Amino acid sequence: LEAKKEENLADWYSQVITKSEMIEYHDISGCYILRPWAYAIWEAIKDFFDAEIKKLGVENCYFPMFVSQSALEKEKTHVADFAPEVAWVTRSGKTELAEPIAIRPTSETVMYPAYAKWVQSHRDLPIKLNQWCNVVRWEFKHPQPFLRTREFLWQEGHSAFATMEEAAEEVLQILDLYAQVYEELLAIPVVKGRKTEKEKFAGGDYTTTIEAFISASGRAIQGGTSHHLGQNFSKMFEIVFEDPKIPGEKQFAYQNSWGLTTRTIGVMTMVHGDNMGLVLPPRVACVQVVIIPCGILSEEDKEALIAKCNDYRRRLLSVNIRVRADLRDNYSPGWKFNHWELKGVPIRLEVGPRDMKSCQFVAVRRDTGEKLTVAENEAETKLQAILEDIQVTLFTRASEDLKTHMVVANTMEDFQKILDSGKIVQIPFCGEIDCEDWIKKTTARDQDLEPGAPSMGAKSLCIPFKPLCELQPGAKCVCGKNPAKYYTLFGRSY
Amino acid sequence: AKKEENLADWYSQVITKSEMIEYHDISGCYILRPWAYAIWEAIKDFFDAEIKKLGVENCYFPMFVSQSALEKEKTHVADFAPEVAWVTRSGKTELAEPIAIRPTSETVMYPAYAKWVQSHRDLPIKLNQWCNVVRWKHPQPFLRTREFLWQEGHSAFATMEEAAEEVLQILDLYAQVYEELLAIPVVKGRKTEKEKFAGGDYTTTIEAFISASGRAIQGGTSHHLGQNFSKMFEIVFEDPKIPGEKQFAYQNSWGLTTRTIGVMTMVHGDNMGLVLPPRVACVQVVIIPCGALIAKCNDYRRRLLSVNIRVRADLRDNYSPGWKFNHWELKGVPIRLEVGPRDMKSCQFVAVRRDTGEKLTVAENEAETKLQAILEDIQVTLFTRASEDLKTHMVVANTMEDFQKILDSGKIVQIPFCGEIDCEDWIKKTTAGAKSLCIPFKPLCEAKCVCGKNKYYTLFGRSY
Ligand SMILES: Nc1ncnc2cc(-c3cccc(S(=O)(=O)NC(=O)[C@@H]4CCCN4)c3)ccc12
Ligand SMILES: Nc1ncnc2cc(-c3cccc(S(=O)(=O)NC(=O)[C@@H]4CCCN4)c3)ccc12
C-alpha cells in the first residue's frame, strides 16, 4: 500500500479494495465489480442469514425486477421518497415502450399486489418471504464501493401477519440477526435503536436499525434495518382478510420490511483494515489459512516439500478449516506473503526444508503479525485456536474503540466539541424534524475540523434501545425550545 | 384442465395451483414463489458444486452496460440489439447517455478481463455469476420470459485446446442437470452457422423435446468464442517465446436458466398436477395424519430425516386430510405417507407414489429402506418414461416428403443436411416452420441434402 489509513482514508480504502482483488471499476458511475474475493464474503453472510431466517419460517422466492408506474405509486409517501431515485426503462432496442417501467429500488410495490391475491382468509397468514437480488437506487449521494453503490446486492424480507403483536416481535428478531451478522461474523459492534421521524422509512410506522462506527473518519453507518409497516401498505394494496371473531368486517394485514446489503463488506474493510491491507475475520474468510513453501534442491526434494504442504491442507480440510496451498512456481515466497497479507488471510502457514525435517511449521497471524513455531502434530487444534482468537481480538479491539468514541453530551456546545473530536454523541432530543434539520445545519456551520475535512453536519443515527444514561426528569432538547423525548445518537455519517 | 386438450390452459393451471408461479402486471414477467424457487436452488446447489471442482469462482458484475462497450463486437451487438432494454432517465432527469440492462454479460466482463491479464500467468480466468438478465415472440412462464434467472460462465485461456475441453465438460454437466436431476433426456449436439451464438466460433447445446406441443427447446448451451471478443476487447498477453508478439486469449461462455423448471413441468406433469423428480424435490415425502397419532408421525419425520430424506409433516389442524392430499398432490410431492389409527395400531402405514398413483402398505420398521427404494424407482421411472417418449418422437428421414410427414405428426427428425444457411432458410419456408435444433454428436444413422442441390445428419423440428 502506498497510502496510509490515518493519512488519507479515501486513497487507503481505494488501494485496499483493489490490491486485495475485491473490487474492479466499471464505466458506469457508482457501479463496481464484486470480484470472487469480495463475493465469497457475501456468500458467507448469505449462508448464515439464510439458515437463521429459515428457522423463523421464512422462505426464499424471486420477484420481478420491473415494477409498473401504477403499482409504484399506490402508497403515496413511499413513492414520494423514492420517485427521484428510480431508474426508468423507456425503450426496447429501438422501439419506445408505450408505458415506461421502473427498476425496483425496493420491492414493496412489486410484491404486495401478489400478497393481496394470496390472502383470501386468516389461514393464509402469516406470509414470510425473502429474496436475494440486486436493486438500483439513483440517490443524490457521493458513491463509494460497497458503502454507497448505484446497484447493490441485498436480501429483502417481507412479512405479513394477522396481528400487530406478531409483526412487532419479528421486527426485533430480524434486528438481532443483523446484529449477529455484524458482531459474530464480521467482529463489528453495533448499536440497536429506533430511527427518528425524519429518518424513518417512508410508508412504515417505525424503523429499527443497527449503527456501526468507523474510527478512522469519525463517521457512523447503518448496517441494516427492520421496519414495521403497520397497515400503510395493506390499505393501499387491499391485503385483507375476515377475522373469525369479527364477522363480516375486513381486516388489514400488519407488515414488516427488512434489508441488508453488500454495504457490510465495506464496513468490515473500514473497521478492521490496516496499513498492510485487508483484515478478514476468520468467520467470513474465504481462505482462513494459506500454506506457502519456503527455502526452494532436487526435483524429488521439491515434490516432497509440496506434498507436506498438501498434507497440511488435507488435515485442515478435515477439521472444517478453509485452507489454500499456494504452490505456484512463478511467485517467490516473499511475493506470496505480501499478496496474501494484502488480501487479509488470517493465518500464513510457512513450511521450509528445515521445518519439515524438524517436524514443525511457522504460523503468522494477520491481525498482530505474531510469528509462532508449532509442532507438526498440533496443527489442527492450535490453528483452530488461533483462528478463534483472531475473531475475538478483532471484535474486542472494535468494541473498545466504539465504547470510547460514543459518549454523552447535554448541551449543543458540549455536543459540538465532542463531535469535532471524531466522536458520536447521545444527546437529549425533542424528536422534531425541525430540531433535527436545525442541528444538521448548525453542527456544520460551527464545525471546527482539520484543514482538509469538508463541511459535514451531523444527522441522527438512532434512538438507542439501551442509552448510556437515563433522561433527567425535566430535560429539554439541545435546541432549548422544547422538552427532550429520548436520548438520541447523533454523528457524522454516510 | 387436461394436458392432451387445452395445453396452455393446463400449463397455467399447473404452475399456479402448484404455487410455483404468480402473474405480474409487466408482460412476460412471472413471480417465482418458494415452490418454484426451491427447484432452482437444488439445480444451483448441484451445478455450483460441479464447476468449483473445475476451478470456477463465483462473482458479481453490474447489470448495466454502456453503449460503447455493447457495440465492441459487431456480430454480437447486431443480434442482441432489438431485445435490449434501455434506461434513459432516473426520476424525471434524462440521462446524458442511455445505459442498457444486460441481456448477457460478455460486454460487461471482458473490459475487466483485459486489465487482469498482463502475462500468460494470469490465465486461465474462470468466473461464474448467478444473476438475472433481460431480453425483450409471445412470453411463456419459465420457457420464454422477459426476465429470467440464470448462471453465466465466462472463461479465458492461453490455448484453444484448454478451452475446447471445458466447453464439452460444461455441456455434460448441463446434461447431468437434465438427465440425472430432472429425469429429462436430451440430445448433445452442435448448432449450425445460422443458429450459433453471435460472436462465437461454435455453439454446443442440449436439446429437450416437449411431446405435448410437438416442440423442442434448448436446455442449455456452451460456446467456444475463440478469439472473437478478445480481439475486440484487447485481452492479450505476451508470447512466451517470441518478443513483441501479442497473443489473443481463447474464450468460452455457458448458460443455464429457469427454463429447466418449465421443461420439467411440461415433460413429467400430468392431469393431477405437477410431478417432481425426487432428486430435485425439496419435500420428498409428506406425512399426513388420517382419521397419539401425531407422535407416530413425528417418529417417521425423525426417522426419515436421519437417512437424509427431505420430509415434511403436515400436522396442521385447520386443514382437512383431504385438502392436504390435493395440496401436496398438485405440488407433485413424490411420496405421501398416510398414517391413521388402524395402521398406527397395526404398526404399518400406506405410501402413495406420485407418478403412478400406486398404493403400498409398509411395515413401520421398513420405512427408511422402502421409501428410499421407492424414491429411486420414481426417479428411474420418470427418466425411463421420458426416454421412451423421446425415442418415439425423434426419427430419421431422407426426403422432404418423408420429413414433412413426420413433422406433421408432432415429432422431430434427423435429416441429411447441406449445411447451407439458405437451405435451412428455405427449409423453414417450405415446412411452414421447422428449424435446426442441433447436429447430434451421436446421430442415429450414418447421400444428399433435402434441397436436392448439394454434410451431416442434423436434427430438425418446430422450436420454442
Ligand atoms: N446505495 C447503497 N449502497 C449500498 N447499500 C445501501 C443500503 C441501503 C439500505 C439498506 C437496507 C435497508 C434500506 S431502507 O431503504 O431503509 N429499507 C428498505 O428498503 C426496506 C427493507 C427491505 C425492503 N424495503 C436501505 C440503501 C442504500 C445503499
Ligand atoms: N426468454 C428466455 N426465457 C428463459 N430462458 C431463456 C434462456 C435463454 C438462453 C439460455 C442459455 C444461453 C443462451 S445464449 O444466448 O445462447 N448464450 C448466452 O447468452 C451466453 C452464454 C452465457 C453468457 N452468454 C440463451 C434465452 C432466452 C430465454
Tab-separated table of N, CA and C in Angstrom, chain A residues 209-281:
chain	number	residue	atom	x	y	z
A	209	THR	N	-32.833	-0.173	13.490
A	209	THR	CA	-31.590	-0.119	12.745
A	209	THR	C	-30.435	-0.542	13.636
A	210	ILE	N	-29.345	-0.943	12.997
A	210	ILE	CA	-28.087	-1.104	13.697
A	210	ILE	C	-27.119	-0.078	13.121
A	211	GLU	N	-26.382	0.594	14.011
A	211	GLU	CA	-25.411	1.593	13.600
A	211	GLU	C	-24.015	1.080	13.939
A	212	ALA	N	-23.109	1.215	12.970
A	212	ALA	CA	-21.721	0.834	13.148
A	212	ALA	C	-20.867	2.093	13.094
A	213	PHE	N	-19.677	2.017	13.690
A	213	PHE	CA	-18.813	3.176	13.794
A	213	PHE	C	-17.484	2.892	13.104
A	214	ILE	N	-17.033	3.851	12.287
A	214	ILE	CA	-15.730	3.781	11.648
A	214	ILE	C	-14.806	4.779	12.339
A	215	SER	N	-13.865	4.259	13.140
A	215	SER	CA	-12.927	5.071	13.905
A	215	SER	C	-12.255	6.124	13.026
A	216	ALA	N	-11.779	5.698	11.850
A	216	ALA	CA	-10.850	6.483	11.052
A	216	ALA	C	-11.444	7.840	10.677
A	217	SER	N	-12.673	7.836	10.145
A	217	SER	CA	-13.279	9.037	9.592
A	217	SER	C	-14.158	9.744	10.619
A	218	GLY	N	-14.406	9.083	11.756
A	218	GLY	CA	-15.270	9.618	12.794
A	218	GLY	C	-16.749	9.513	12.426
A	219	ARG	N	-17.075	8.661	11.446
A	219	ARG	CA	-18.432	8.592	10.931
A	219	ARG	C	-19.075	7.255	11.272
A	220	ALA	N	-20.408	7.292	11.349
A	220	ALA	CA	-21.222	6.124	11.626
A	220	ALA	C	-21.939	5.710	10.344
A	221	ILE	N	-22.385	4.451	10.288
A	221	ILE	CA	-23.087	3.955	9.119
A	221	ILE	C	-24.130	2.931	9.554
A	222	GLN	N	-25.240	2.906	8.812
A	222	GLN	CA	-26.331	1.976	9.045
A	222	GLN	C	-25.942	0.614	8.482
A	223	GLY	N	-26.071	-0.432	9.306
A	223	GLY	CA	-25.667	-1.777	8.928
A	223	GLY	C	-26.824	-2.575	8.332
A	224	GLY	N	-28.035	-2.323	8.837
A	224	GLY	CA	-29.253	-2.951	8.350
A	224	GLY	C	-30.459	-2.338	9.054
A	225	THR	N	-31.664	-2.581	8.524
A	225	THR	CA	-32.867	-2.009	9.106
A	225	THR	C	-34.031	-2.984	8.991
A	226	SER	N	-34.901	-2.923	10.006
A	226	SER	CA	-36.099	-3.734	10.117
A	226	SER	C	-37.270	-2.800	10.409
A	227	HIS	N	-38.263	-2.763	9.515
A	227	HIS	CA	-39.352	-1.811	9.648
A	227	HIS	C	-40.645	-2.518	10.024
A	228	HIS	N	-41.469	-1.815	10.800
A	228	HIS	CA	-42.870	-2.156	10.928
A	228	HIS	C	-43.660	-1.206	10.035
A	229	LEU	N	-44.319	-1.785	9.023
A	229	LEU	CA	-45.049	-1.029	8.021
A	229	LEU	C	-46.510	-0.870	8.427
A	230	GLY	N	-46.890	-1.497	9.547
A	230	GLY	CA	-48.262	-1.467	10.019
A	230	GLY	C	-49.228	-1.882	8.915
A	231	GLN	N	-50.217	-1.021	8.656
A	231	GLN	CA	-51.238	-1.290	7.660
A	231	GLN	C	-51.179	-0.251	6.543
A	232	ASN	N	-50.069	0.485	6.442
A	232	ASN	CA	-49.980	1.559	5.468
A	232	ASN	C	-50.044	0.977	4.061
A	233	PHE	N	-49.352	-0.149	3.851
A	233	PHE	CA	-49.333	-0.805	2.554
A	233	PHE	C	-50.586	-1.660	2.358
A	234	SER	N	-51.113	-2.285	3.424
A	234	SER	CA	-52.222	-3.217	3.248
A	234	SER	C	-53.515	-2.477	2.899
A	235	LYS	N	-53.657	-1.221	3.343
A	235	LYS	CA	-54.826	-0.427	2.993
A	235	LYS	C	-54.760	-0.018	1.523
A	236	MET	N	-53.544	0.156	0.994
A	236	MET	CA	-53.370	0.594	-0.382
A	236	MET	C	-53.460	-0.583	-1.355
A	237	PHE	N	-52.955	-1.764	-0.969
A	237	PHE	CA	-52.898	-2.903	-1.878
A	237	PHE	C	-54.043	-3.887	-1.630
A	238	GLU	N	-54.884	-3.605	-0.626
A	238	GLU	CA	-56.037	-4.431	-0.286
A	238	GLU	C	-55.592	-5.843	0.099
A	239	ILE	N	-54.584	-5.940	0.973
A	239	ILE	CA	-54.247	-7.212	1.593
A	239	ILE	C	-55.148	-7.352	2.816
A	240	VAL	N	-56.260	-8.073	2.632
A	240	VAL	CA	-57.348	-8.062	3.595
A	240	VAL	C	-57.828	-9.488	3.845
A	241	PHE	N	-58.427	-9.687	5.021
A	241	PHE	CA	-58.980	-10.968	5.415
A	241	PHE	C	-60.096	-10.713	6.419
A	242	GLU	N	-60.963	-11.714	6.591
A	242	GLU	CA	-62.053	-11.635	7.545
A	242	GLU	C	-61.641	-12.379	8.812
A	243	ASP	N	-61.714	-11.684	9.953
A	243	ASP	CA	-61.429	-12.284	11.244
A	243	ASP	C	-62.615	-13.154	11.647
A	244	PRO	N	-62.395	-14.422	12.066
A	244	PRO	CA	-63.494	-15.266	12.544
A	244	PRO	C	-64.264	-14.625	13.699
A	245	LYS	N	-63.534	-13.957	14.600
A	245	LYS	CA	-64.125	-13.357	15.786
A	245	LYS	C	-64.835	-12.042	15.462
A	246	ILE	N	-64.544	-11.427	14.307
A	246	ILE	CA	-65.155	-10.152	13.954
A	246	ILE	C	-65.907	-10.305	12.633
A	247	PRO	N	-67.128	-10.885	12.653
A	247	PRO	CA	-67.845	-11.245	11.425
A	247	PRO	C	-68.119	-10.103	10.448
A	248	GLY	N	-67.870	-10.372	9.157
A	248	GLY	CA	-68.322	-9.522	8.067
A	248	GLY	C	-67.490	-8.250	7.905
A	249	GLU	N	-66.381	-8.139	8.650
A	249	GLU	CA	-65.549	-6.945	8.628
A	249	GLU	C	-64.149	-7.308	8.140
A	250	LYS	N	-63.639	-6.511	7.196
A	250	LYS	CA	-62.377	-6.813	6.548
A	250	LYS	C	-61.248	-6.177	7.353
A	251	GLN	N	-60.287	-7.015	7.748
A	251	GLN	CA	-59.118	-6.580	8.489
A	251	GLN	C	-57.974	-6.355	7.507
A	252	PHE	N	-57.079	-5.423	7.846
A	252	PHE	CA	-55.877	-5.186	7.067
A	252	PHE	C	-54.704	-5.875	7.756
A	253	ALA	N	-53.833	-6.501	6.959
A	253	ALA	CA	-52.692	-7.223	7.496
A	253	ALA	C	-51.627	-6.244	7.980
A	254	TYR	N	-50.881	-6.690	8.996
A	254	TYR	CA	-49.747	-5.963	9.533
A	254	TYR	C	-48.487	-6.495	8.869
A	255	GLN	N	-47.582	-5.592	8.474
A	255	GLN	CA	-46.459	-5.984	7.635
A	255	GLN	C	-45.136	-5.398	8.128
A	256	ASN	N	-44.064	-6.106	7.769
A	256	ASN	CA	-42.705	-5.746	8.117
A	256	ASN	C	-41.848	-5.788	6.860
A	257	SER	N	-40.794	-4.976	6.839
A	257	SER	CA	-39.808	-4.979	5.775
A	257	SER	C	-38.448	-5.089	6.426
A	258	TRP	N	-37.541	-5.906	5.901
A	258	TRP	CA	-36.201	-5.883	6.467
A	258	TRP	C	-35.140	-6.092	5.388
A	259	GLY	N	-34.003	-5.385	5.487
A	259	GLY	CA	-32.996	-5.448	4.434
A	259	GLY	C	-31.547	-5.301	4.908
A	260	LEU	N	-30.639	-6.012	4.224
A	260	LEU	CA	-29.208	-5.951	4.483
A	260	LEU	C	-28.477	-6.097	3.149
A	261	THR	N	-27.385	-5.344	2.950
A	261	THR	CA	-26.767	-5.238	1.636
A	261	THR	C	-25.280	-5.566	1.723
A	262	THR	N	-24.609	-5.480	0.568
A	262	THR	CA	-23.167	-5.640	0.461
A	262	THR	C	-22.428	-4.433	1.050
A	263	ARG	N	-23.153	-3.485	1.658
A	263	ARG	CA	-22.531	-2.425	2.439
A	263	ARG	C	-21.676	-3.019	3.556
A	264	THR	N	-22.147	-4.135	4.133
A	264	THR	CA	-21.463	-4.874	5.187
A	264	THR	C	-19.974	-5.034	4.894
A	265	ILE	N	-19.650	-5.375	3.644
A	265	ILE	CA	-18.288	-5.711	3.271
A	265	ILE	C	-17.409	-4.469	3.414
A	266	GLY	N	-17.947	-3.310	3.025
A	266	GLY	CA	-17.224	-2.056	3.145
A	266	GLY	C	-16.953	-1.712	4.608
A	267	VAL	N	-17.944	-1.971	5.463
A	267	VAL	CA	-17.841	-1.663	6.878
A	267	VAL	C	-16.728	-2.515	7.489
A	268	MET	N	-16.693	-3.793	7.099
A	268	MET	CA	-15.679	-4.735	7.546
A	268	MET	C	-14.285	-4.245	7.151
A	269	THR	N	-14.169	-3.679	5.945
A	269	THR	CA	-12.895	-3.191	5.445
A	269	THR	C	-12.457	-1.969	6.249
A	270	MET	N	-13.379	-1.017	6.433
A	270	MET	CA	-13.077	0.249	7.084
A	270	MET	C	-12.713	0.037	8.551
A	271	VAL	N	-13.382	-0.917	9.208
A	271	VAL	CA	-13.186	-1.157	10.629
A	271	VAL	C	-11.868	-1.895	10.869
A	272	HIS	N	-11.644	-3.025	10.187
A	272	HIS	CA	-10.519	-3.888	10.526
A	272	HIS	C	-9.300	-3.661	9.636
A	273	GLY	N	-9.489	-3.055	8.459
A	273	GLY	CA	-8.389	-2.871	7.523
A	273	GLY	C	-7.249	-2.079	8.157
A	274	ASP	N	-6.006	-2.420	7.803
A	274	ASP	CA	-4.856	-1.745	8.382
A	274	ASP	C	-3.940	-1.267	7.259
A	275	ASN	N	-2.705	-0.893	7.608
A	275	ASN	CA	-1.780	-0.349	6.629
A	275	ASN	C	-1.060	-1.456	5.864
A	276	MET	N	-1.241	-2.717	6.263
A	276	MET	CA	-0.688	-3.817	5.489
A	276	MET	C	-1.776	-4.432	4.608
A	277	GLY	N	-3.008	-3.904	4.683
A	277	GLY	CA	-4.065	-4.318	3.772
A	277	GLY	C	-5.386	-4.625	4.477
A	278	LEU	N	-6.135	-5.544	3.861
A	278	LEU	CA	-7.422	-6.005	4.345
A	278	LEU	C	-7.189	-6.947	5.517
A	279	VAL	N	-8.146	-7.021	6.441
A	279	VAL	CA	-8.080	-7.995	7.516
A	279	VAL	C	-9.401	-8.748	7.554
A	280	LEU	N	-9.353	-10.054	7.302
A	280	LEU	CA	-10.573	-10.836	7.247
A	280	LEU	C	-10.838	-11.458	8.612
A	281	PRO	N	-12.048	-11.258	9.174
A	281	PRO	CA	-12.493	-12.038	10.323
A	281	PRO	C	-12.568	-13.491	9.871
